[PDB]
Amino acid sequence: KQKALAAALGQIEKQFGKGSIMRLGEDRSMDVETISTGSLSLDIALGAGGLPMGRIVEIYGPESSGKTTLTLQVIAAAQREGKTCAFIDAEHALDPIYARKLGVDIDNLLCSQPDTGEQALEICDALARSGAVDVIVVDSVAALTPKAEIEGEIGDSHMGLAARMMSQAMRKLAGNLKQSNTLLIFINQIRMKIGVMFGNPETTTGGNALKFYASVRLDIRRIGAVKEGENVVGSETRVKVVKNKIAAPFKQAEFQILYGEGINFYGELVDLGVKEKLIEKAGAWYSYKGEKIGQGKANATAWLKDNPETAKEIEKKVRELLLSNPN
Ligand SMILES: [Mg+2]
16 A cells, blocks of 8 residues: 555654654655764764754763764864854763864863753753754763752652653753754763663663653664774774654664774775775775775775865765765
C-alpha cells in the first residue's frame, strides 16, 4: 500500500508533527537553522548538517568521552557565525585554554555558575525568553544539584528530585527556546550504578523530561586512541545520534579528537571525501579533481588544511551528497 502508506504517514505527521515518523533512509530533514558540531561526519549523522537552533539537544557520554570538545566546538562554531553563547556551568570544569584552542571566544562567552540546579534551569529559561542568546550549553545535567539535595533534605531520592527538577522546567524551556530560536545543549552522562539496570542501561541522568523533549540526543564515547608514534595524541571518537527529530536518527559519526587541537575535521573530510569518491586515494597519490593533494591520509589532511578553499569545496559536495535534504 505505497500510496496508503504515504497518506497514513502524512496523516500521522499531520496529527503528530513532521518527522514524528519517517523511513530511516529518507533524505528528509527539518528546515531548521543549524550550527556545526565541528565534526563533518556528525553534522552529517545529524542529517540537517548541525545541531538545530531553537531545540534542546542532549549530549551524553563518559568523562573524556569528547562531549566537552563537542560542546566547545559548537560554541566555537556558533560564535564564528556571530552567535551569542551562554555556558551554564554547574560542573566548574571549563578549560578556557583548551576552549580557545578549539576556537571558543572565551572573552565573549557568557557564563553562569548557578547556586542550584533549579536556578540553573531558570537562568536557561530566562536566557531562552530573552531571545538574545543563540546557544546555551548546560554543563551538566548530573551536576545540576536540586536545591534540596544541596540543603541535605536529600530524604526524597536524588534520582527522584533531579528528575522532578528537570521535568518541571523542560516544557517551558523547550517552548521559549523554540520562540527565541535558541539552541540549548544539555551535557549528561549515563546515570550512576544503583539500577540494576533496567531499563536501557544507557539511561542518562535527570529523568525523562530531557529524554523526550530533546530534538536531538547524542551518545558520545571514546572508542580508542589516536597515536602518532608510540605517543598518544588523541581519542578516536564515536558519536551515535540516538534520537533525531530534525532528520532520521541512529546515524553515527566517528572522528578523532586530537589533544590540544580538537576534532580532526580534515581527517573526516579526507575520509568522507574518499568514501564519496570525491577524493581519489589510489596509486601513490590522493587527489581531488585530478590534482595531487597528498601521499597518505595524513598528508591529504594537512593539504586540505592548507587549502581551505578546496577543503570547503569538498565539504560542500560532501554535504550535498550526504546531508539528508531533498535532492
Ligand atoms: Mg593517485
